[PDB]
Design a protein around this motif. Structure first.
Motif, mmCIF file in Angstrom:
data_model
loop_
_atom_site.group_PDB
_atom_site.id
_atom_site.type_symbol
_atom_site.label_atom_id
_atom_site.label_comp_id
_atom_site.label_asym_id
_atom_site.label_seq_id
_atom_site.Cartn_x
_atom_site.Cartn_y
_atom_site.Cartn_z
ATOM 1 N N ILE A 177 0.837 15.503 1.613
ATOM 2 C CA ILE A 177 -0.567 15.214 1.541
ATOM 3 C C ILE A 177 -0.943 15.204 0.328
ATOM 4 O O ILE A 177 -1.982 14.368 -0.141
ATOM 5 C CB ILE A 177 -1.262 16.250 2.605
ATOM 6 C CG1 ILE A 177 -0.966 15.733 3.902
ATOM 7 C CG2 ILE A 177 -2.869 16.030 2.286
ATOM 8 C CD1 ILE A 177 -1.102 16.893 4.943
ATOM 9 N N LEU A 178 -0.795 16.272 -0.647
ATOM 10 C CA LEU A 178 -1.189 16.097 -2.070
ATOM 11 C C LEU A 178 -0.803 15.246 -2.719
ATOM 12 O O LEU A 178 -1.460 14.859 -3.792
ATOM 13 C CB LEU A 178 -1.144 17.600 -2.660
ATOM 14 C CG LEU A 178 -2.041 18.438 -3.284
ATOM 15 C CD1 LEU A 178 -3.338 18.354 -2.423
ATOM 16 C CD2 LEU A 178 -1.619 19.696 -3.570
ATOM 17 N N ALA A 179 0.292 14.675 -2.537
ATOM 18 C CA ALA A 179 0.917 13.443 -3.083
ATOM 19 C C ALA A 179 0.207 12.083 -2.406
ATOM 20 O O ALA A 179 -0.727 12.367 -1.868
ATOM 21 C CB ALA A 179 2.465 13.261 -3.197
ATOM 22 N N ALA A 180 0.619 10.899 -2.680
ATOM 23 C CA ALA A 180 0.227 9.947 -2.197
ATOM 24 C C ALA A 180 -1.297 9.361 -2.271
ATOM 25 O O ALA A 180 -1.873 8.725 -1.898
ATOM 26 C CB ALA A 180 0.073 9.866 -0.500
ATOM 27 N N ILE A 181 -1.630 10.238 -3.553
ATOM 28 C CA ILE A 181 -3.075 9.990 -3.983
ATOM 29 C C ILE A 181 -3.079 8.868 -4.596
ATOM 30 O O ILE A 181 -2.220 8.906 -5.729
ATOM 31 C CB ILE A 181 -3.522 11.165 -4.721
ATOM 32 C CG1 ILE A 181 -4.152 12.323 -4.045
ATOM 33 C CG2 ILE A 181 -4.725 10.626 -5.690
ATOM 34 C CD1 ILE A 181 -4.166 13.658 -4.666
ATOM 35 N N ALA A 182 -3.771 7.582 -4.331
ATOM 36 C CA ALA A 182 -3.593 6.270 -5.049
ATOM 37 C C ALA A 182 -4.054 6.535 -6.332
ATOM 38 O O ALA A 182 -5.189 7.152 -6.814
ATOM 39 C CB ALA A 182 -4.342 5.418 -4.256
ATOM 40 N N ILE A 183 -3.607 5.776 -7.195
ATOM 41 C CA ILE A 183 -3.678 5.683 -8.692
ATOM 42 C C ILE A 183 -4.491 4.363 -8.955
ATOM 43 O O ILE A 183 -3.636 3.511 -8.860
ATOM 44 C CB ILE A 183 -2.572 6.279 -9.735
ATOM 45 C CG1 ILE A 183 -2.216 7.569 -9.502
ATOM 46 C CG2 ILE A 183 -2.856 5.823 -11.140
ATOM 47 C CD1 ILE A 183 -3.262 8.508 -9.555
ATOM 48 N N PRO A 184 -5.454 4.175 -9.252
ATOM 49 C CA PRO A 184 -6.171 2.802 -9.562
ATOM 50 C C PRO A 184 -5.518 2.146 -11.119
ATOM 51 O O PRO A 184 -5.160 3.036 -11.741
ATOM 52 C CB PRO A 184 -7.537 3.130 -9.628
ATOM 53 C CG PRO A 184 -7.920 4.668 -9.948
ATOM 54 C CD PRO A 184 -6.713 5.125 -9.415
ATOM 55 N N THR A 233 -4.301 -5.007 -4.932
ATOM 56 C CA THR A 233 -3.709 -5.074 -6.012
ATOM 57 C C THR A 233 -3.855 -6.342 -6.649
ATOM 58 O O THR A 233 -2.948 -6.691 -7.737
ATOM 59 C CB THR A 233 -2.233 -4.675 -5.559
ATOM 60 O OG1 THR A 233 -1.446 -5.891 -5.411
ATOM 61 C CG2 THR A 233 -2.092 -3.756 -4.773
ATOM 62 N N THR A 234 -4.427 -7.344 -6.034
ATOM 63 C CA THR A 234 -4.626 -8.607 -6.940
ATOM 64 C C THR A 234 -5.253 -8.433 -8.084
ATOM 65 O O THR A 234 -6.019 -7.435 -8.628
ATOM 66 C CB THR A 234 -5.584 -9.478 -5.957
ATOM 67 O OG1 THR A 234 -5.044 -9.565 -4.666
ATOM 68 C CG2 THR A 234 -5.711 -10.887 -6.660
ATOM 69 N N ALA A 235 -4.699 -9.159 -9.210
ATOM 70 C CA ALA A 235 -5.029 -9.177 -10.589
ATOM 71 C C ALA A 235 -6.503 -9.494 -10.718
ATOM 72 O O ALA A 235 -6.970 -10.700 -10.390
ATOM 73 C CB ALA A 235 -4.246 -9.853 -11.526
ATOM 74 N N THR A 253 -9.881 -10.707 -12.099
ATOM 75 C CA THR A 253 -10.285 -11.729 -13.088
ATOM 76 C C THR A 253 -11.672 -11.214 -13.763
ATOM 77 O O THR A 253 -12.168 -10.034 -13.897
ATOM 78 C CB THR A 253 -10.271 -13.282 -12.358
ATOM 79 O OG1 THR A 253 -11.707 -13.153 -11.877
ATOM 80 C CG2 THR A 253 -9.258 -13.077 -11.253
ATOM 81 N N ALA A 254 -12.155 -12.057 -14.537
ATOM 82 C CA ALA A 254 -13.475 -12.004 -15.415
ATOM 83 C C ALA A 254 -14.600 -11.765 -14.440
ATOM 84 O O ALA A 254 -15.533 -11.175 -14.672
ATOM 85 C CB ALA A 254 -13.708 -12.986 -16.465
ATOM 86 N N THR A 255 -14.638 -12.573 -13.048
ATOM 87 C CA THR A 255 -15.474 -12.366 -12.304
ATOM 88 C C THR A 255 -15.379 -11.668 -10.796
ATOM 89 O O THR A 255 -16.194 -10.985 -10.669
ATOM 90 C CB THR A 255 -15.763 -13.830 -11.989
ATOM 91 O OG1 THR A 255 -15.004 -14.202 -10.625
ATOM 92 C CG2 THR A 255 -15.703 -14.819 -12.922
ATOM 93 N N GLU A 256 -14.001 -11.258 -10.760
ATOM 94 C CA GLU A 256 -13.667 -10.523 -9.703
ATOM 95 C C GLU A 256 -12.954 -9.258 -10.233
ATOM 96 O O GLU A 256 -12.150 -9.233 -11.102
ATOM 97 C CB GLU A 256 -12.596 -11.173 -8.665
ATOM 98 C CG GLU A 256 -13.199 -12.463 -7.943
ATOM 99 C CD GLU A 256 -12.646 -13.785 -8.352
ATOM 100 O OE1 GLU A 256 -11.656 -13.760 -9.034
ATOM 101 O OE2 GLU A 256 -13.455 -14.818 -8.119
#
Lengths: 72, 72
Positions: free
Chosen positions: A15-22, B64-66, B68-71
């Motif tokens: 649970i402590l894993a799986a933390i999404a990395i943006p 996860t879509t790349a 853009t300059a507007t989105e």
């Protein structure tokens, strides 16, 4: 030590894993662009002032050498 | 094999049982809450930065879509 103790530990580890990395490279790229622009922006003042005072454009160089009356 | 041998084994089996098992679902729930908060916390930076740069709020999506300059 009980197996329930260890299985709870394993579950909490999962649970402590799986933390999404943006995404973070965009922030670094934007900061690099801002830093570069802020680095080269004040050089506009130097060039414009030297041209206003009559210093030749070919004499406006980049470096820490002490600027003379003819070189900047 | 003697009956005293087997009765001692039975007694030690009973003693090795009866080990109290404390509550553990609270730990899992707390870890899940912490993991969720740590997952959605960095998304505050993305939204605030995109709003600061002028990107429309409706254009700030999740995926996860790349970007853009507007989105974003």
């Amino acid at each position: 030590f009980t197996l329930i103790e260890l299985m709870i530990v394993v579950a909490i580890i999962g649970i402590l894993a799986a933390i999404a990395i943006p995404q973070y490279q965009n922030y670094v790229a934007r900061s690099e662009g801002a830093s570069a622009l802020a680095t080269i922006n004040p050089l506009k003042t130097t060039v414009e002032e030297s041209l206003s005072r009559g210093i030749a454009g070919s004499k406006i160089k980049i470096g820490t050498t002490a600027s003379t009356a003819t070189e900047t």
